[PDB]
Amino acid sequence: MLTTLIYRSQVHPDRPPVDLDALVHRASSKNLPLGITGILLFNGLQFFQVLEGTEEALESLFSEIQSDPRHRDVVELMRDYSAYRRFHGTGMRILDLRLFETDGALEEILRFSTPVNDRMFRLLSAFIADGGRYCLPEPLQPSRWMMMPTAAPQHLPGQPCQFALQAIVEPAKKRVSSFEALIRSPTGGSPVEMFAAIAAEDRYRFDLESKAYAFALAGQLPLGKHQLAINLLPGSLYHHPDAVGWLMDSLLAAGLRPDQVLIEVTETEVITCFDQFRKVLKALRVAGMKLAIDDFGAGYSGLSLLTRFQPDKIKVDAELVRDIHISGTKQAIVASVVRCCEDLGITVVAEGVETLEEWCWLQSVGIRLFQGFLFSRPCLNGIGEICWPVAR
Amino acid sequence: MLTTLIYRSQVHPDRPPVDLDALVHRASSKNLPLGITGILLFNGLQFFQVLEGTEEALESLFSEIQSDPRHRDVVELMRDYSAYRRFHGTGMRILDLRLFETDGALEEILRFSTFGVTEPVNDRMFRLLSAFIADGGRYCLPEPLQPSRWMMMAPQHLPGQPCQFALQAIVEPAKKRVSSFEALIRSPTGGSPVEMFAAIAAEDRYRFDLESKAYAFALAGQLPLGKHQLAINLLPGSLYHHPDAVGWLMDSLLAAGLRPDQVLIEVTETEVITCFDQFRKVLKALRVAGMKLAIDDFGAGYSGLSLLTRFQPDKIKVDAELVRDIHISGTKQAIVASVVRCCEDLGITVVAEGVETLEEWCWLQSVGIRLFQGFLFSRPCLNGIGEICWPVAR
Ligand SMILES: Nc1nc2c(ncn2[C@@H]2O[C@@H]3COP(=O)(O)O[C@H]4[C@@H](O)[C@H](n5cnc6c(=O)[nH]c(N)nc65)O[C@@H]4COP(=O)(O)O[C@H]3[C@H]2O)c(=O)[nH]1
Ligand SMILES: Nc1nc2c(ncn2[C@@H]2O[C@@H]3COP(=O)(O)O[C@H]4[C@@H](O)[C@H](n5cnc6c(=O)[nH]c(N)nc65)O[C@@H]4COP(=O)(O)O[C@H]3[C@H]2O)c(=O)[nH]1
Ligand SMILES: Cc1cc2nc3c(=O)[nH]c(=O)nc-3n(C[C@H](O)[C@H](O)[C@H](O)COP(=O)(O)O)c2cc1C
Ligand SMILES: Cc1cc2nc3c(=O)[nH]c(=O)nc-3n(C[C@H](O)[C@H](O)[C@H](O)COP(=O)(O)O)c2cc1C
Ligand SMILES: [Mn+2]
Ligand SMILES: [Mn+2]
Ligand SMILES: [Mn+2]
Ligand SMILES: [Mn+2]
């Protein structure tokens, strides 16, 4: 089974130059007996390599390549099965693009390779035309940042539920943007643990009802000028005819403003019925409450949803964040949600941010609002401690 | 009830500069009795106006504003129900951005506006305002791509067959080149795919869908396949519920004098997403075989770029729903521009389909579409290659 692997990487710019003639010859000598072929592209700052061979030969080679100190920021762009070798007879071969006139490098490629409808070919072009695009800038290296560190956890009695709060942060302004309320059982357990105790047919009712205790928690904080974010299933919003009006009454009694309350609905559940949700949407807009699409990029129905309606906020799902520093796929998609939301005036939050590596690459694709264990953990009935990225 | 209406537009650079003083006086004087507030930004080439008022008032005004000869390329950005007026003052203020340095324009805006208890940056209107001040010229339509600077410039039935195919050219206007042909199934009487499949038993539809393609392959083999690609439409089930569909297609296209790489399979976006994990083995086999894969009708229904996380197609066809009235829709403009950029980063080819007007071609090309399919260029041609119309100057 033939397979194609493509990645891009960067040189260490303050270190002595790597002898690439030696690298490439040694590589070509090693690749061909093992049934590995392909090319290397160098532009002065970045590498771009295509590899062809069996799944097993490429995996073992790429592990060595990943851990090679002679470059950094290895980002995979393509891993897929292949119909034929595009570089038959070429173990390895470098093209220094700086030695080439316009179109010249591509025309050399085409003369030893074995045409514009190919995914490998289009990416090559894309690297030659604009390689420095998803290059991680020097200030935004994870090694040039440092996370720096008191919460008051409290049990509230006489309550059928309680809530933890997680900060959504804007590290560029060292500012809390908003807090998300996350439901907990009476004994501090998970959302699942909470809803499992409630009878199945009362779960929509309970979901709506429980929000009153989150508003109360926001009121006694006393929150001030920060937004409150709240997870509701669409079905909970259809429970009572005046579910929106009840939310309003409840949040005002907690001393909150409507523009201060934001509703989080999951991407998968909105696409179920646009007929009944739009009546709720209209009620939320008229009342002044804001809407967010939670876990965007997970439930398949992505960016075309904006044709039907536009939320105030979009929360990028954790799956798009996991290993976004090594995935070109994820980088491209996330960066396209950013740019689309910027033109539409939609707030973008990245979720499940756990590592400096994740924060840096997300910052480099243009995300400013962040939510994750890296910055802030859920804190039962209070504001938890917040960690900020500090420069080096 | 209260409504927001935000748009941007572009002045005619050919014509004399617009009297803004007369504009703003008659605007604010007419707006005042009608209960219309808001703001107007101007950068020299572009207008950007926020309008607040009742739904019926803003509709009536937008009619006149769209009809106004003092500007063109009116692009609607936001229209929704509002809870409170962001601009509370009388009438209409004008803010010439040329006379402000960085951050200075937002300062001035915040003098005439409140955005609730929370930071102004949490409001969509304020974000759209900030975006215009930062880079309003982004979706400004260039001069060479104005519609007024362009203009547009036989085979029979085969009823004795179980089915026939119409061919439609996918074109690249810039290089005056036909990129590929799509095969669209037709009934023995020349009728639509719907009528065709309606005549086939439900238990037999998948098999028919796959086995019909032999007639499409035979058609393209009889035609000048001059290093052009052939696109064909298949349901997921048609590939999935066959013993070895890829092998069958391989046998059928090779027999007809075609290369594996000349054949591209189109699958509809909606029918793939709730099917994917089961459908993986077929997509894999098509890759190894050498055939190409397109996501047909991208944007249609309930799917998007989140699909591209899973697997990556060779081609993406933006649905006509997104191409429809893209010239007046900033939402579609932003969506399509984003998909184009995304696919460039992923090495995925993009076709805009259902292109009907010079207007659509212009706006699509400006946001980075190079490949087109629609009635503007080429209509479906039964059993042959149709006449392709090209856009040229004046
Ligand atoms: N691995 C990882 N996880 C992180 C990170 N940051 C936050 N999380 C977790 O992600 C969940 C918040 O996202 P969610 O879409 O609201 O996912 C929530 C939310 O959908 C939900 N939920 C919470 N409250 C309610 C509610 O009142 N009603 C409904 N219907 N659902 C709720 O149940 C889900 C489970 O929530 P939680 O236990 O609160 O788990 C929280 C949070 O702990 C991180 O950096 N890494
Ligand atoms: N208004 C407008 N329409 C345009 C324009 N350009 C093309 N079309 C039409 O859009 C349809 C092609 O899009 P499709 O995604 O393949 O959507 C097609 C395609 O999915 C499909 N179909 C065609 N052949 C087959 C087939 O063999 N198998 C399957 N499963 N579906 C097929 O049935 C759908 C309807 O097809 P058609 O009657 O052939 O109608 C064609 C075509 O006539 C345009 O500029 N404006
Ligand atoms: C940009 C880059 C491309 C590389 N390409 C290859 C290659 O194609 N084949 C290979 O064997 N090693 C390649 N390497 C080197 C490997 O990381 C590793 O050092 C080498 O395979 C060690 O093999 P050896 O110990 O047998 O000499 C590359 C390294 C870098 C920096
Ligand atoms: C960019 C621009 C913004 C405009 N804004 C307004 C406005 O806010 N209110 C208004 O009444 N007319 C506005 N107009 C003018 C209208 O298009 C139209 O000329 C106006 O209704 C005058 O018609 P009249 O004969 O009833 O006075 C605007 C025109 C332009 C080109
Ligand atoms: Mn949530
Ligand atoms: Mn979430
Ligand atoms: Mn099609
Ligand atoms: Mn289509």
Q: What is the 3-state secondary structure (H, E, C) of chain B?
A: CEEEEEEEEECCCCCCCCCHHHHHHHHHHHHHHHCCEEEEEECCCEEEEEEEEEHHHHHHHHHHHHHCCCCEEEEEEEEEECCCCCECCCCCEEEEHHHCCCCHHHHHHHCCECCCCCCHHHCHHHHHHHHHHHHHHHHCCCHHHCHHHEEECCCCCCCCCCCEEEEEEEEEHHHCEEEEEEEEEECCCCCCHHHHHHHCCHHHHHHHHHHCHHHHHHHHHHCCCCCCEEEEECCHHHHHCCCCHHHHHHHHHHHCCCCHHHEEEEEECHHHHCCHHHHHHHHHHHHHHCCEEEEEEECCCCCCCCHHHHCCCCEEEECHHHHCCCCCEHHHHHHHHHHHHHHHHHCCEEEEECCCCHHHHHHHHHCCCCEEECCCCCCCEECCCCCCCCEEEC
B295 alpha carbon to ligand 6 midpoint, in Å?
28
Q: How many residues does chain A have?
A: 392
- The alpha carbon of residue B193 is apart from the nearest alpha carbon of chain A, in Å, by 26
The amino acid present at B127, given as its one-letter code, is: R
Of A82, A130, A84, A125, the residue nearest A106 (C-alpha): A125
Peptide bond into A222 cis (omega under 30): yes
Q: 3-state SS of chain A?
A: CEEEEEEEEEECCCCCCCCHHHHHHHHHHHHCCCCCEEEEEECCCEEEEEEEEEHHHHHHHHHHHHCCCCEEEEEEEEEEECCCCCCCCCCCCEEEHHHCCCCHHHHHHHHHCCCCCCHHHHHHHHHHHHCCCCCCCHHHCHHHEEEECCCCCCCCCCCCCEEEEEEEEEHHHCEEEEEEEEEECCCCCCHHHHHHHCCHHHHHHHHHHHHHHHHHHHHCCCCCCCEEEEECCHHHHCCCCCHHHHHHHHHHHCCCCHHHEEEEEEHHHHCCCHHHHHHHHHHHHHHCCEEEEEEECCCCCCHHHHHCCCCCEEEECHHHHCCCCCEHHHHHHHHHHHHHHHHHCCEEEECCCCCHHHHHHHHHCCCCEECCCCCECCEECCCCCECEEEEC
- Alpha carbon distance A42, A46 (integer Å): 6
Instruction: Give the rounded distance of the alpha carbon of A217 from its chain centre.
Output: 29
- Alpha carbon distance B289, B385 (integer Å): 27
Contacts of residue A307, defined as CB under 8 A and 6 or more positions apart, other chains included, come to B299, B321, B322, B331, B332, B335
Sign of the C-alpha dihedral, residues A179, A182, A187, A190? negative
Contacts of residue A283, defined as CB under 8 A and 6 or more positions apart, other chains included, come to A244, A245
Q: After which residues does a break in chain A occur, C–N more than 2.5 Å?
A: 114, 149
- Alpha carbon distance A326, A334 (integer Å): 13
* Binary contact (B81, A286; C-beta < 8 A): yes
Pick the atom of ligand 3 nearest to A38's CA.
Answer: 8
Of A286, A334, A340, the residue nearest A310 (C-alpha): A340
What residues does ligand 2 touch, defined as CB less than 6 Å away?
Answer: B 168, 184-185, 192-193, 209, 212, 233-235, 296-297, 354-356, 373-375, 380
Residue spans in chain A of domains classed CATH 3.20.20.450: 136-392
Residue spans in chain B of domains classed CATH 3.30.70.100: 1-140
C-alpha pair distances (Å), A7 with each of A10, A76, A304, B306? 11, 4, 29, 21
Contact between A329 and B308 (Cβ < 8 Å) = yes
Backbone φ/ψ region at A288: left (φ over 0), alpha (ψ -120 to 50), beta: left
Put simply, whether A227 touches B (Cβ < 8 Å) is yes
- The alpha carbon of residue A343 is apart from the nearest alpha carbon of chain B, in Å, by 6
Backbone φ/ψ region at A171: left (φ over 0), alpha (ψ -120 to 50), beta: alpha
Q: How many residues does chain B have?
A: 394
Neighbours of A243 (CB within 10 A): 20
Put simply, whether A385 touches B (Cβ < 8 Å) is no
Residue A114: list chain B partners with CB under 8 A: none
- Alpha carbon distance B140, B73 (integer Å): 9
Neighbours of A147 (CB within 10 A): 13
- Alpha carbon distance B10, B149 (integer Å): 16
* Binary contact (B290, A83; C-beta < 8 A): yes
Contact between A257 and A277 (Cβ < 8 Å) = no
Contacts of residue B117, defined as CB under 8 A and 6 or more positions apart, other chains included, come to A225, A257, A259, A260
Q: Tokens standing for B71?
A: 């500007």
For residue A335, the chain B residue with the least C-alpha distance is: B342
CATH class of domain segment(s) A136-392: alpha beta
Contact between B7 and B77 (Cβ < 8 Å) = yes
Q: What is the CA radius of gyration of chain B?
A: 26
Helices A119-130, A104-112: inter-axial angle, 10-degree rounding: 150
Contacts of residue A237, defined as CB under 8 A and 6 or more positions apart, other chains included, come to A208, A243, A244, A263, A277, A280
- Alpha carbon distance B24, B94 (integer Å): 7
- According to CATH, the topology of domain B1-140 is Alpha-Beta Plaits (3.30.70)
Of B58, B307, B269, the residue nearest A319 (C-alpha): B307
Q: Tokens standing for B364?
A: 């699509």
Contact between A91 and A37 (Cβ < 8 Å) = yes
Resolution in angstroms comes to: 2.5
The amino acid present at A168, given as its one-letter code, is: I
The residue whose CA is least distant from atom 21 of ligand 4 is B64
CA angle A132, A135, A137 (to 5 degrees): 115
Contact between A52 and A3 (Cβ < 8 Å) = yes
Distance in angstroms between the alpha carbons of the first and the last residue of chain B: 46
Contact between A311 and A288 (Cβ < 8 Å) = no
Contact between B295 and B265 (Cβ < 8 Å) = no
C-alpha pair distances (Å), A142 with each of A13, A361, A363, A364? 16, 9, 11, 11
Distance in angstroms between the alpha carbons of the first and the last residue of chain A: 46
β-pairing verdict for A2-11 and A71-81 = antiparallel
A369 alpha carbon to ligand 6 midpoint, in Å?
13
Contact between A281 and A251 (Cβ < 8 Å) = no
Neighbours of B275 (CB within 10 A): 15
Contact between A229 and A351 (Cβ < 8 Å) = no
- Alpha carbon distance B174, B355 (integer Å): 15
Q: Phi and psi dihedrals of A257, rounded to 5? A: -100, 155
The amino acid present at B12, given as its one-letter code, is: H
Contacts of residue B197, defined as CB under 8 A and 6 or more positions apart, other chains included, come to B205, B208, B209
The architecture CATH gives domain A1-135: 2-Layer Sandwich (3.30)
Instruction: Give the rounded distance of the alpha carbon of A119 from its chain centre.
Output: 24
Q: What is the CATH number of domain B141-394?
A: 3.20.20.450
Q: Phi and psi dihedrals of A259, rounded to 5? A: -65, -5
Q: Phi and psi dihedrals of B89, rounded to 5? A: -65, 170
Q: What is the CA radius of gyration of chain A?
A: 26
Structure determination method? X-ray
- Alpha carbon distance B312, B301 (integer Å): 19
Q: What is the number of alpha carbons within 13 Å of residue B259 lying toward its C-beta?
A: 11
- Alpha carbon distance B333, B322 (integer Å): 9
C-alpha pair distances (Å), A73 with each of A8, A324, B152? 8, 11, 49
Residue spans in chain B of domains classed CATH 3.20.20.450: 141-394
Of A282, A351, A288, the residue nearest A314 (C-alpha): A351
| Tokens 């990129």 belong to residue | B179
